[PDB]
PDB file of C-alpha atoms in Angstrom:
ATOM      1  CA  UNK A   1     -35.892 -91.132  95.142  1.00  0.00           C
ATOM      2  CA  UNK A   2     -35.280 -89.449  91.547  1.00  0.00           C
ATOM      3  CA  UNK A   3     -38.777 -90.242  90.238  1.00  0.00           C
ATOM      4  CA  UNK A   4     -38.251 -87.554  87.312  1.00  0.00           C
ATOM      5  CA  UNK A   5     -35.342 -87.851  84.888  1.00  0.00           C
ATOM      6  CA  UNK A   6     -31.590 -86.654  85.693  1.00  0.00           C
ATOM      7  CA  UNK A   7     -30.257 -87.077  82.463  1.00  0.00           C
ATOM      8  CA  UNK A   8     -31.852 -84.238  80.858  1.00  0.00           C
ATOM      9  CA  UNK A   9     -31.808 -82.293  84.280  1.00  0.00           C
ATOM     10  CA  UNK A  10     -27.922 -82.007  83.695  1.00  0.00           C
ATOM     11  CA  UNK A  11     -28.814 -78.981  81.515  1.00  0.00           C
ATOM     12  CA  UNK A  12     -31.726 -77.259  79.699  1.00  0.00           C
ATOM     13  CA  UNK A  13     -32.657 -73.648  78.557  1.00  0.00           C
ATOM     14  CA  UNK A  14     -34.547 -71.200  80.620  1.00  0.00           C
ATOM     15  CA  UNK A  15     -35.653 -68.972  77.950  1.00  0.00           C
ATOM     16  CA  UNK A  16     -36.146 -65.817  79.713  1.00  0.00           C
ATOM     17  CA  UNK A  17     -36.799 -63.417  77.616  1.00  0.00           C
ATOM     18  CA  UNK A  18     -35.801 -59.408  78.841  1.00  0.00           C
ATOM     19  CA  UNK A  19     -38.851 -57.862  80.502  1.00  0.00           C
ATOM     20  CA  UNK A  20     -39.487 -54.615  82.202  1.00  0.00           C
ATOM     21  CA  UNK A  21     -41.795 -54.068  85.287  1.00  0.00           C
ATOM     22  CA  UNK A  22     -41.953 -52.460  88.749  1.00  0.00           C
ATOM     23  CA  UNK A  23     -43.022 -53.489  92.492  1.00  0.00           C
ATOM     24  CA  UNK A  24     -42.372 -56.567  94.715  1.00  0.00           C
ATOM     25  CA  UNK A  25     -44.126 -59.605  95.821  1.00  0.00           C
ATOM     26  CA  UNK A  26     -45.326 -61.568  93.266  1.00  0.00           C
ATOM     27  CA  UNK A  27     -48.614 -63.653  92.984  1.00  0.00           C
ATOM     28  CA  UNK A  28     -48.858 -66.961  90.711  1.00  0.00           C
ATOM     29  CA  UNK A  29     -52.040 -69.424  90.329  1.00  0.00           C
ATOM     30  CA  UNK A  30     -51.726 -72.554  88.403  1.00  0.00           C
ATOM     31  CA  UNK A  31     -54.961 -74.595  87.709  1.00  0.00           C
ATOM     32  CA  UNK A  32     -55.783 -77.539  85.526  1.00  0.00           C
ATOM     33  CA  UNK A  33     -58.902 -78.126  83.670  1.00  0.00           C
ATOM     34  CA  UNK A  34     -60.047 -81.467  81.716  1.00  0.00           C
ATOM     35  CA  UNK A  35     -62.665 -81.504  78.648  1.00  0.00           C
ATOM     36  CA  UNK A  36     -64.396 -83.868  76.450  1.00  0.00           C
ATOM     37  CA  UNK A  37     -61.966 -86.514  74.731  1.00  0.00           C
ATOM     38  CA  UNK A  38     -59.664 -85.983  77.735  1.00  0.00           C
ATOM     39  CA  UNK A  39     -58.097 -82.289  76.928  1.00  0.00           C
ATOM     40  CA  UNK A  40     -55.814 -80.365  78.637  1.00  0.00           C
ATOM     41  CA  UNK A  41     -56.330 -77.162  80.007  1.00  0.00           C
ATOM     42  CA  UNK A  42     -54.095 -75.099  81.685  1.00  0.00           C
ATOM     43  CA  UNK A  43     -54.970 -71.453  83.460  1.00  0.00           C
ATOM     44  CA  UNK A  44     -52.236 -69.252  84.819  1.00  0.00           C
ATOM     45  CA  UNK A  45     -53.148 -65.990  86.668  1.00  0.00           C
ATOM     46  CA  UNK A  46     -50.435 -63.172  87.890  1.00  0.00           C
ATOM     47  CA  UNK A  47     -51.226 -60.315  90.001  1.00  0.00           C
ATOM     48  CA  UNK A  48     -49.276 -57.846  92.133  1.00  0.00           C
ATOM     49  CA  UNK A  49     -49.911 -56.517  95.050  1.00  0.00           C
ATOM     50  CA  UNK A  50     -48.602 -52.681  95.627  1.00  0.00           C
ATOM     51  CA  UNK A  51     -48.695 -52.674  91.554  1.00  0.00           C
ATOM     52  CA  UNK A  52     -51.865 -52.691  89.760  1.00  0.00           C
ATOM     53  CA  UNK A  53     -51.553 -54.972  86.566  1.00  0.00           C
ATOM     54  CA  UNK A  54     -52.978 -58.343  86.531  1.00  0.00           C
ATOM     55  CA  UNK A  55     -52.643 -60.505  83.968  1.00  0.00           C
ATOM     56  CA  UNK A  56     -54.106 -64.300  82.727  1.00  0.00           C
ATOM     57  CA  UNK A  57     -52.673 -66.592  80.212  1.00  0.00           C
ATOM     58  CA  UNK A  58     -54.800 -69.794  79.364  1.00  0.00           C
ATOM     59  CA  UNK A  59     -53.629 -73.150  77.008  1.00  0.00           C
ATOM     60  CA  UNK A  60     -56.270 -75.569  75.579  1.00  0.00           C
ATOM     61  CA  UNK A  61     -54.833 -78.918  74.492  1.00  0.00           C
ATOM     62  CA  UNK A  62     -56.847 -81.036  71.879  1.00  0.00           C
ATOM     63  CA  UNK A  63     -55.695 -84.898  71.992  1.00  0.00           C
ATOM     64  CA  UNK A  64     -57.541 -88.089  71.620  1.00  0.00           C
ATOM     65  CA  UNK A  65     -54.935 -90.743  72.314  1.00  0.00           C
ATOM     66  CA  UNK A  66     -51.233 -92.113  72.397  1.00  0.00           C
ATOM     67  CA  UNK A  67     -51.222 -92.974  68.526  1.00  0.00           C
ATOM     68  CA  UNK A  68     -52.029 -89.600  66.649  1.00  0.00           C
ATOM     69  CA  UNK A  69     -51.891 -85.830  66.879  1.00  0.00           C
ATOM     70  CA  UNK A  70     -52.742 -83.409  69.494  1.00  0.00           C
ATOM     71  CA  UNK A  71     -53.391 -79.556  68.294  1.00  0.00           C
ATOM     72  CA  UNK A  72     -52.837 -77.421  71.448  1.00  0.00           C
ATOM     73  CA  UNK A  73     -53.809 -73.658  71.013  1.00  0.00           C
ATOM     74  CA  UNK A  74     -54.743 -70.726  73.354  1.00  0.00           C
ATOM     75  CA  UNK A  75     -53.539 -67.470  74.591  1.00  0.00           C
ATOM     76  CA  UNK A  76     -50.118 -66.832  75.802  1.00  0.00           C
ATOM     77  CA  UNK A  77     -49.048 -64.062  78.192  1.00  0.00           C
ATOM     78  CA  UNK A  78     -47.878 -60.729  76.745  1.00  0.00           C
ATOM     79  CA  UNK A  79     -51.162 -61.078  74.567  1.00  0.00           C
ATOM     80  CA  UNK A  80     -49.455 -63.530  72.417  1.00  0.00           C
ATOM     81  CA  UNK A  81     -51.300 -66.412  70.272  1.00  0.00           C
ATOM     82  CA  UNK A  82     -50.237 -70.106  70.974  1.00  0.00           C
ATOM     83  CA  UNK A  83     -50.705 -72.614  68.511  1.00  0.00           C
ATOM     84  CA  UNK A  84     -48.590 -76.275  68.495  1.00  0.00           C
ATOM     85  CA  UNK A  85     -48.910 -79.932  67.136  1.00  0.00           C
ATOM     86  CA  UNK A  86     -47.171 -83.002  68.584  1.00  0.00           C
ATOM     87  CA  UNK A  87     -48.226 -86.298  67.420  1.00  0.00           C
ATOM     88  CA  UNK A  88     -46.526 -89.752  68.720  1.00  0.00           C
ATOM     89  CA  UNK A  89     -46.121 -93.062  66.992  1.00  0.00           C
ATOM     90  CA  UNK A  90     -47.331 -96.557  68.813  1.00  0.00           C
ATOM     91  CA  UNK A  91     -45.918 -99.308  66.190  1.00  0.00           C
ATOM     92  CA  UNK A  92     -42.111 -99.531  66.951  1.00  0.00           C
ATOM     93  CA  UNK A  93     -42.404 -96.293  69.118  1.00  0.00           C
ATOM     94  CA  UNK A  94     -39.130 -94.672  69.539  1.00  0.00           C
ATOM     95  CA  UNK A  95     -39.745 -90.949  67.659  1.00  0.00           C
ATOM     96  CA  UNK A  96     -41.593 -87.815  68.465  1.00  0.00           C
ATOM     97  CA  UNK A  97     -43.011 -84.810  66.436  1.00  0.00           C
ATOM     98  CA  UNK A  98     -43.220 -81.778  68.056  1.00  0.00           C
ATOM     99  CA  UNK A  99     -44.237 -78.523  66.123  1.00  0.00           C
ATOM    100  CA  UNK A 100     -44.407 -75.126  68.300  1.00  0.00           C
ATOM    101  CA  UNK A 101     -45.848 -71.986  66.767  1.00  0.00           C
ATOM    102  CA  UNK A 102     -46.700 -68.315  67.944  1.00  0.00           C
ATOM    103  CA  UNK A 103     -47.834 -65.328  67.211  1.00  0.00           C
ATOM    104  CA  UNK A 104     -47.425 -62.096  68.426  1.00  0.00           C
ATOM    105  CA  UNK A 105     -49.948 -59.456  66.602  1.00  0.00           C
ATOM    106  CA  UNK A 106     -49.642 -56.747  69.691  1.00  0.00           C
ATOM    107  CA  UNK A 107     -46.318 -55.140  68.139  1.00  0.00           C
ATOM    108  CA  UNK A 108     -44.698 -58.574  67.438  1.00  0.00           C
ATOM    109  CA  UNK A 109     -43.925 -61.147  65.060  1.00  0.00           C
ATOM    110  CA  UNK A 110     -44.407 -64.972  64.218  1.00  0.00           C
ATOM    111  CA  UNK A 111     -42.274 -67.687  65.859  1.00  0.00           C
ATOM    112  CA  UNK A 112     -41.810 -71.095  64.429  1.00  0.00           C
ATOM    113  CA  UNK A 113     -40.123 -73.934  65.748  1.00  0.00           C
ATOM    114  CA  UNK A 114     -40.089 -77.312  65.431  1.00  0.00           C
ATOM    115  CA  UNK A 115     -38.904 -80.297  67.979  1.00  0.00           C
ATOM    116  CA  UNK A 116     -38.152 -84.077  67.685  1.00  0.00           C
ATOM    117  CA  UNK A 117     -37.588 -86.286  70.246  1.00  0.00           C
ATOM    118  CA  UNK A 118     -35.608 -89.843  69.345  1.00  0.00           C
ATOM    119  CA  UNK A 119     -35.229 -92.314  71.860  1.00  0.00           C
ATOM    120  CA  UNK A 120     -32.638 -95.352  71.290  1.00  0.00           C
ATOM    121  CA  UNK A 121     -31.023 -98.040  73.322  1.00  0.00           C
ATOM    122  CA  UNK A 122     -29.456 -95.696  75.784  1.00  0.00           C
ATOM    123  CA  UNK A 123     -29.362 -92.473  74.136  1.00  0.00           C
ATOM    124  CA  UNK A 124     -31.998 -89.360  73.054  1.00  0.00           C
ATOM    125  CA  UNK A 125     -31.457 -87.391  70.325  1.00  0.00           C
ATOM    126  CA  UNK A 126     -33.415 -83.868  70.021  1.00  0.00           C
ATOM    127  CA  UNK A 127     -33.616 -82.357  66.606  1.00  0.00           C
ATOM    128  CA  UNK A 128     -34.749 -79.012  66.996  1.00  0.00           C
ATOM    129  CA  UNK A 129     -34.906 -76.159  63.815  1.00  0.00           C
ATOM    130  CA  UNK A 130     -36.389 -72.564  63.939  1.00  0.00           C
ATOM    131  CA  UNK A 131     -38.077 -72.134  60.709  1.00  0.00           C
ATOM    132  CA  UNK A 132     -40.154 -68.766  59.555  1.00  0.00           C
ATOM    133  CA  UNK A 133     -38.336 -66.104  62.060  1.00  0.00           C
ATOM    134  CA  UNK A 134     -35.779 -64.579  60.010  1.00  0.00           C
ATOM    135  CA  UNK A 135     -33.181 -67.072  59.551  1.00  0.00           C
ATOM    136  CA  UNK A 136     -33.099 -71.115  59.430  1.00  0.00           C
ATOM    137  CA  UNK A 137     -31.579 -72.454  62.385  1.00  0.00           C
ATOM    138  CA  UNK A 138     -30.860 -76.178  63.065  1.00  0.00           C
ATOM    139  CA  UNK A 139     -29.458 -77.520  66.713  1.00  0.00           C
ATOM    140  CA  UNK A 140     -29.006 -81.033  68.117  1.00  0.00           C
ATOM    141  CA  UNK A 141     -29.527 -81.651  71.795  1.00  0.00           C
ATOM    142  CA  UNK A 142     -28.173 -85.300  72.815  1.00  0.00           C
ATOM    143  CA  UNK A 143     -28.651 -86.180  76.151  1.00  0.00           C
ATOM    144  CA  UNK A 144     -27.868 -89.741  77.616  1.00  0.00           C
ATOM    145  CA  UNK A 145     -28.619 -91.508  81.101  1.00  0.00           C
ATOM    146  CA  UNK A 146     -27.247 -94.667  82.627  1.00  0.00           C
ATOM    147  CA  UNK A 147     -27.334 -96.415  86.075  1.00  0.00           C
ATOM    148  CA  UNK A 148     -25.253 -94.117  88.133  1.00  0.00           C
ATOM    149  CA  UNK A 149     -23.777 -92.208  85.016  1.00  0.00           C
ATOM    150  CA  UNK A 150     -25.434 -89.031  83.231  1.00  0.00           C
ATOM    151  CA  UNK A 151     -24.716 -87.112  80.022  1.00  0.00           C
ATOM    152  CA  UNK A 152     -25.746 -84.155  78.030  1.00  0.00           C
ATOM    153  CA  UNK A 153     -24.714 -82.351  75.201  1.00  0.00           C
ATOM    154  CA  UNK A 154     -26.321 -79.415  73.076  1.00  0.00           C
ATOM    155  CA  UNK A 155     -25.281 -77.773  69.863  1.00  0.00           C
ATOM    156  CA  UNK A 156     -26.289 -75.286  67.267  1.00  0.00           C
ATOM    157  CA  UNK A 157     -25.598 -75.048  63.583  1.00  0.00           C
ATOM    158  CA  UNK A 158     -26.787 -72.779  61.623  1.00  0.00           C
ATOM    159  CA  UNK A 159     -27.578 -73.105  57.759  1.00  0.00           C
ATOM    160  CA  UNK A 160     -27.861 -69.593  56.838  1.00  0.00           C
ATOM    161  CA  UNK A 161     -25.415 -68.481  58.736  1.00  0.00           C
ATOM    162  CA  UNK A 162     -23.024 -71.321  58.174  1.00  0.00           C
ATOM    163  CA  UNK A 163     -21.245 -70.844  62.013  1.00  0.00           C
ATOM    164  CA  UNK A 164     -21.901 -72.952  65.268  1.00  0.00           C
ATOM    165  CA  UNK A 165     -22.752 -70.125  67.880  1.00  0.00           C
ATOM    166  CA  UNK A 166     -22.268 -72.328  71.024  1.00  0.00           C
ATOM    167  CA  UNK A 167     -22.311 -75.695  72.336  1.00  0.00           C
ATOM    168  CA  UNK A 168     -23.071 -76.572  75.949  1.00  0.00           C
ATOM    169  CA  UNK A 169     -21.453 -79.754  77.532  1.00  0.00           C
ATOM    170  CA  UNK A 170     -22.658 -81.377  80.704  1.00  0.00           C
ATOM    171  CA  UNK A 171     -21.328 -84.612  82.551  1.00  0.00           C
ATOM    172  CA  UNK A 172     -22.232 -86.220  86.045  1.00  0.00           C
ATOM    173  CA  UNK A 173     -22.893 -89.082  88.032  1.00  0.00           C
ATOM    174  CA  UNK A 174     -24.956 -89.884  90.703  1.00  0.00           C
ATOM    175  CA  UNK A 175     -23.872 -91.773  93.744  1.00  0.00           C
ATOM    176  CA  UNK A 176     -25.559 -92.993  96.877  1.00  0.00           C
ATOM    177  CA  UNK A 177     -23.486 -90.932  99.005  1.00  0.00           C
ATOM    178  CA  UNK A 178     -22.585 -87.692  97.082  1.00  0.00           C
ATOM    179  CA  UNK A 179     -23.641 -86.300  93.198  1.00  0.00           C
ATOM    180  CA  UNK A 180     -21.144 -85.004  90.753  1.00  0.00           C
ATOM    181  CA  UNK A 181     -22.317 -82.598  88.277  1.00  0.00           C
ATOM    182  CA  UNK A 182     -20.030 -81.077  85.677  1.00  0.00           C
ATOM    183  CA  UNK A 183     -21.003 -78.517  83.204  1.00  0.00           C
ATOM    184  CA  UNK A 184     -18.943 -76.333  80.900  1.00  0.00           C
ATOM    185  CA  UNK A 185     -19.778 -73.841  78.115  1.00  0.00           C
ATOM    186  CA  UNK A 186     -18.136 -73.572  74.376  1.00  0.00           C
ATOM    187  CA  UNK A 187     -17.151 -70.287  75.650  1.00  0.00           C
ATOM    188  CA  UNK A 188     -14.354 -71.081  78.084  1.00  0.00           C
ATOM    189  CA  UNK A 189     -16.656 -71.430  81.233  1.00  0.00           C
ATOM    190  CA  UNK A 190     -16.189 -73.861  83.513  1.00  0.00           C
ATOM    191  CA  UNK A 191     -19.063 -75.016  86.110  1.00  0.00           C
ATOM    192  CA  UNK A 192     -18.890 -77.497  89.117  1.00  0.00           C
ATOM    193  CA  UNK A 193     -21.608 -78.728  90.879  1.00  0.00           C
ATOM    194  CA  UNK A 194     -21.767 -81.019  93.633  1.00  0.00           C
ATOM    195  CA  UNK A 195     -24.580 -82.257  95.910  1.00  0.00           C
ATOM    196  CA  UNK A 196     -23.893 -83.744  99.644  1.00  0.00           C
ATOM    197  CA  UNK A 197     -26.335 -84.914 102.664  1.00  0.00           C
ATOM    198  CA  UNK A 198     -25.379 -83.885 106.082  1.00  0.00           C
ATOM    199  CA  UNK A 199     -28.352 -85.850 107.920  1.00  0.00           C
ATOM    200  CA  UNK A 200     -31.320 -87.067 108.043  1.00  0.00           C
ATOM    201  CA  UNK A 201     -33.958 -84.811 106.412  1.00  0.00           C
ATOM    202  CA  UNK A 202     -31.436 -82.676 105.906  1.00  0.00           C
ATOM    203  CA  UNK A 203     -29.031 -82.388 102.400  1.00  0.00           C
ATOM    204  CA  UNK A 204     -26.853 -79.192 101.171  1.00  0.00           C
ATOM    205  CA  UNK A 205     -25.512 -78.535  97.798  1.00  0.00           C
ATOM    206  CA  UNK A 206     -22.372 -76.837  96.662  1.00  0.00           C
ATOM    207  CA  UNK A 207     -21.648 -74.950  93.193  1.00  0.00           C
ATOM    208  CA  UNK A 208     -18.945 -72.923  91.695  1.00  0.00           C
ATOM    209  CA  UNK A 209     -18.399 -70.932  88.321  1.00  0.00           C
ATOM    210  CA  UNK A 210     -15.423 -70.547  86.706  1.00  0.00           C
ATOM    211  CA  UNK A 211     -14.774 -68.019  83.743  1.00  0.00           C
ATOM    212  CA  UNK A 212     -11.662 -68.266  81.680  1.00  0.00           C
ATOM    213  CA  UNK A 213     -10.731 -64.800  81.597  1.00  0.00           C
ATOM    214  CA  UNK A 214     -10.308 -63.584  85.155  1.00  0.00           C
ATOM    215  CA  UNK A 215      -9.196 -64.949  88.720  1.00  0.00           C
ATOM    216  CA  UNK A 216     -12.764 -64.464  90.281  1.00  0.00           C
ATOM    217  CA  UNK A 217     -14.858 -67.220  90.855  1.00  0.00           C
ATOM    218  CA  UNK A 218     -18.441 -67.462  91.595  1.00  0.00           C
ATOM    219  CA  UNK A 219     -18.944 -69.629  94.532  1.00  0.00           C
ATOM    220  CA  UNK A 220     -22.563 -70.698  95.782  1.00  0.00           C
ATOM    221  CA  UNK A 221     -24.457 -72.380  98.707  1.00  0.00           C
ATOM    222  CA  UNK A 222     -27.415 -74.311  98.471  1.00  0.00           C
ATOM    223  CA  UNK A 223     -30.007 -75.488 101.486  1.00  0.00           C
ATOM    224  CA  UNK A 224     -32.284 -78.148 101.199  1.00  0.00           C
ATOM    225  CA  UNK A 225     -34.427 -79.110 104.335  1.00  0.00           C
ATOM    226  CA  UNK A 226     -36.973 -81.711 103.636  1.00  0.00           C
ATOM    227  CA  UNK A 227     -38.416 -83.143 106.965  1.00  0.00           C
ATOM    228  CA  UNK A 228     -41.616 -84.362 105.562  1.00  0.00           C
ATOM    229  CA  UNK A 229     -43.379 -84.348 101.652  1.00  0.00           C
ATOM    230  CA  UNK A 230     -46.212 -81.868 103.093  1.00  0.00           C
ATOM    231  CA  UNK A 231     -43.312 -79.206 103.377  1.00  0.00           C
ATOM    232  CA  UNK A 232     -40.258 -78.669 101.494  1.00  0.00           C
ATOM    233  CA  UNK A 233     -37.220 -76.082 102.267  1.00  0.00           C
ATOM    234  CA  UNK A 234     -35.310 -75.260  99.265  1.00  0.00           C
ATOM    235  CA  UNK A 235     -32.738 -71.834  99.449  1.00  0.00           C
ATOM    236  CA  UNK A 236     -29.869 -71.231  97.511  1.00  0.00           C
ATOM    237  CA  UNK A 237     -27.327 -68.217  97.888  1.00  0.00           C
ATOM    238  CA  UNK A 238     -24.104 -67.416  96.347  1.00  0.00           C
ATOM    239  CA  UNK A 239     -20.739 -65.484  97.103  1.00  0.00           C
ATOM    240  CA  UNK A 240     -22.338 -62.356  98.450  1.00  0.00           C
ATOM    241  CA  UNK A 241     -23.686 -61.708  94.788  1.00  0.00           C
ATOM    242  CA  UNK A 242     -27.683 -63.315  95.507  1.00  0.00           C
ATOM    243  CA  UNK A 243     -29.346 -64.629  98.392  1.00  0.00           C
ATOM    244  CA  UNK A 244     -32.625 -66.355  97.486  1.00  0.00           C
ATOM    245  CA  UNK A 245     -34.552 -68.571  99.866  1.00  0.00           C
ATOM    246  CA  UNK A 246     -38.141 -70.548  98.790  1.00  0.00           C
ATOM    247  CA  UNK A 247     -40.050 -73.081 101.020  1.00  0.00           C
ATOM    248  CA  UNK A 248     -43.675 -74.806 100.092  1.00  0.00           C
ATOM    249  CA  UNK A 249     -45.931 -76.206 102.514  1.00  0.00           C
ATOM    250  CA  UNK A 250     -49.392 -78.248 102.208  1.00  0.00           C
ATOM    251  CA  UNK A 251     -52.162 -77.930 104.410  1.00  0.00           C
ATOM    252  CA  UNK A 252     -54.162 -80.766 105.602  1.00  0.00           C
ATOM    253  CA  UNK A 253     -56.450 -80.526 102.768  1.00  0.00           C
ATOM    254  CA  UNK A 254     -55.782 -80.402  99.172  1.00  0.00           C
ATOM    255  CA  UNK A 255     -54.486 -77.271  99.368  1.00  0.00           C
ATOM    256  CA  UNK A 256     -50.563 -76.797  98.796  1.00  0.00           C
ATOM    257  CA  UNK A 257     -48.987 -73.274  98.300  1.00  0.00           C
ATOM    258  CA  UNK A 258     -45.198 -72.432  97.588  1.00  0.00           C
ATOM    259  CA  UNK A 259     -44.179 -69.065  99.051  1.00  0.00           C
ATOM    260  CA  UNK A 260     -40.222 -68.114  98.400  1.00  0.00           C
ATOM    261  CA  UNK A 261     -38.161 -64.421  98.917  1.00  0.00           C
ATOM    262  CA  UNK A 262     -35.160 -63.024  97.001  1.00  0.00           C
ATOM    263  CA  UNK A 263     -32.618 -60.846  98.863  1.00  0.00           C
ATOM    264  CA  UNK A 264     -30.325 -58.698  96.537  1.00  0.00           C
ATOM    265  CA  UNK A 265     -26.712 -58.709  98.326  1.00  0.00           C
ATOM    266  CA  UNK A 266     -28.618 -59.489 101.760  1.00  0.00           C
ATOM    267  CA  UNK A 267     -28.671 -55.142 101.684  1.00  0.00           C
ATOM    268  CA  UNK A 268     -32.585 -54.883 100.429  1.00  0.00           C
ATOM    269  CA  UNK A 269     -34.094 -55.487 103.838  1.00  0.00           C
ATOM    270  CA  UNK A 270     -33.531 -51.561 103.608  1.00  0.00           C
ATOM    271  CA  UNK A 271     -36.773 -51.158 101.283  1.00  0.00           C
ATOM    272  CA  UNK A 272     -36.567 -53.246  98.165  1.00  0.00           C
ATOM    273  CA  UNK A 273     -36.877 -56.826  98.994  1.00  0.00           C
ATOM    274  CA  UNK A 274     -38.380 -59.067  96.165  1.00  0.00           C
ATOM    275  CA  UNK A 275     -40.768 -62.043  97.005  1.00  0.00           C
ATOM    276  CA  UNK A 276     -42.682 -64.650  95.024  1.00  0.00           C
ATOM    277  CA  UNK A 277     -45.871 -66.676  95.442  1.00  0.00           C
ATOM    278  CA  UNK A 278     -47.251 -69.776  93.662  1.00  0.00           C
ATOM    279  CA  UNK A 279     -50.567 -71.593  94.147  1.00  0.00           C
ATOM    280  CA  UNK A 280     -51.647 -75.144  92.583  1.00  0.00           C
ATOM    281  CA  UNK A 281     -55.009 -76.182  92.878  1.00  0.00           C
ATOM    282  CA  UNK A 282     -56.237 -79.529  91.436  1.00  0.00           C
ATOM    283  CA  UNK A 283     -59.824 -79.910  90.375  1.00  0.00           C
ATOM    284  CA  UNK A 284     -61.168 -82.976  91.720  1.00  0.00           C
ATOM    285  CA  UNK A 285     -64.487 -83.578  90.047  1.00  0.00           C
TER     286      UNK A 285
END
């Protein structure tokens, strides 16, 4: 069943910053901790097999209850200072205040972005504004979720530049048989996605990318094999552009681990394949 939300899944940013490195096979570990008053602790650890460079991030969230404010601060990767504050209201709930603040002293800068979540009868409005970052930006993301129908739109307006950069549109529906997902970019970019289940404990997906400008289409096939909740196989492949496959398994006890592999043009086997491993432990005390 679709436990998580599907209306917001229709579209979302990744925030993949430009980074540089060297070496394959990357190991990652995520752990959760609790503190007095019910705090949220998140520890992330990354290490490389060949390369000799290990990093470790930490996150601390100080909260108390629903109606109130929570201060979450700590240290993020790239030697960055994390500091955000989110407060929620109980009486007549429907709005959420969130403020994300980060400061990078190591040859970096200070970034301040505020986010607000508003829930309506059947529509959600997200107000996001970037302040103190060399130009005040104001973007708004509106998402809707209906029984069988899904909608999602995101726009960004600039008060200092006075011109909307780009707008992302997403619309689709979930059927008892197949799933329809449509996504287009204001940049004349058409994107189609559909999900189809082959047989029991087996499901497939198909994706197609279209860019107004040439007769070249980017096709892609997704394979999902779920025979049990103990192990899930999820792989994604494109039109000879990129071939990736990821699978996760959980031992008898509380030991779950996810391992995947990346193959570029299915020709990296010669000596240049990529791999990603991520372990998640749960403190049961």
